[PDB]
Amino acid sequence: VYQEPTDPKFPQQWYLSGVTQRDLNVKAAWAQGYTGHGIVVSILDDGIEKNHPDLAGNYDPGASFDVNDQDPDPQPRYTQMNDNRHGTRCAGEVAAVANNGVCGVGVAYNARIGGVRMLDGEVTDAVEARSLGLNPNHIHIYSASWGPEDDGKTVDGPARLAEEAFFRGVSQGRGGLGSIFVWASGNGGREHDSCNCDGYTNSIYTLSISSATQFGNVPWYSEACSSTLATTYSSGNQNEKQIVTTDLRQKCTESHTGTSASAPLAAGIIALTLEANKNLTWRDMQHLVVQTSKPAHLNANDWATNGVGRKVSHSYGYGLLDAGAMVALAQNWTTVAPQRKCIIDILTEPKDIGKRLEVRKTVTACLGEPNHITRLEHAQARLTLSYNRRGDLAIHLVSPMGTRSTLLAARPHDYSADGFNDWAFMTTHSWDEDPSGEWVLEIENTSEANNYGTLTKFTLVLYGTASGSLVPR
């Protein structure tokens, strides 16, 4: 019979388990025997307190490096403000030691935990690449609770070295099965930011994770977008509980908050899943998340049923992660077929945007060719356009199965006249749909201003396979 942790703050970790059903169902995975043994997770952040009494027992120097100072020791830089506490808080969510009379427990409390000190300094492309590409045959899962500024006017993503690190990681990392990159979707809710304007979350190679409050609501800091894949609990208002984890200076905190807390919890759940089947590929893991995540009782006004019967929201992706269901489905998972990529150049001429532009195109999704896709995974609309005030644009993409993805919602603070330069807007909302048929792109001016611009390129990029479908939900 499984005995739950006795740690003093475990009763306050409302998001791990409970009679109430408002949790991530993590105790169910523990009771199946999965606690993270043998899995290695690295926190890419401002450092990790490797001697913390709730981390030392799981700490892994092979999962760690200091990119800011170019040494092996990721110890945080101590200051009066305790600025560099962020990575230690994230690490405890994944892998705080259990049953040791200290603080609470990690989701994967027997996993090995490291940290890359890379935020405490100028975060260049090279710095990112050296962190994302650290020891990729030892680290299984990378967790990143950082990104481009959430001011609601930035459009930015991985530069060349970081993108090369993503492709090297998913292609050759983890023995060719692919590094697992987990990303926090963003804290830009107050600025009406869109997490599709963030190339890290928008990447197909990352699992972008959003947040829900204890009472099941969209937190004030949440960013909505189509690239988000799933959700874990985090903070909300001051009547809602927060996240319990290890804090700087060997302390325990019950007030970890924001998007930053959601990605580590997802990384821990993914660690449990990898323990249940170490042969899962990076794409397998995304399939498991899509199939097992739970919308129930998460409140949103945009829940929609996609072409294969799954509920999907721009605030939550496919819903809350469910650790018990993840580890159960993982055990007899059949590896997905190799990934196909079908490139469809849509336009035959530039198109003036004006007040509203609708572009319709019927596609065969590479019918008759080795990259024929009947089973979609990610879809991208790679758009090149000029516009005089970017944040007045709203962009939607409708799949042949009728699923309307918001590629871009209005961003009131985005005054830029720089438009989009082959920006690869991504949606997860048509996962497992057949992409043959009519796609519709909609671009509209959401303001009364007499705005102007031109769409000059629209590449529809489809990823997926031609086999292995389930009967729709």
Binding site: V123, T124, P148
Partner: peptide, 4 residues
């Protein structure tokens, strides 16, 4: 360039 990048933020926590």
């Amino acid at each position: 360039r990048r933020k926590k």
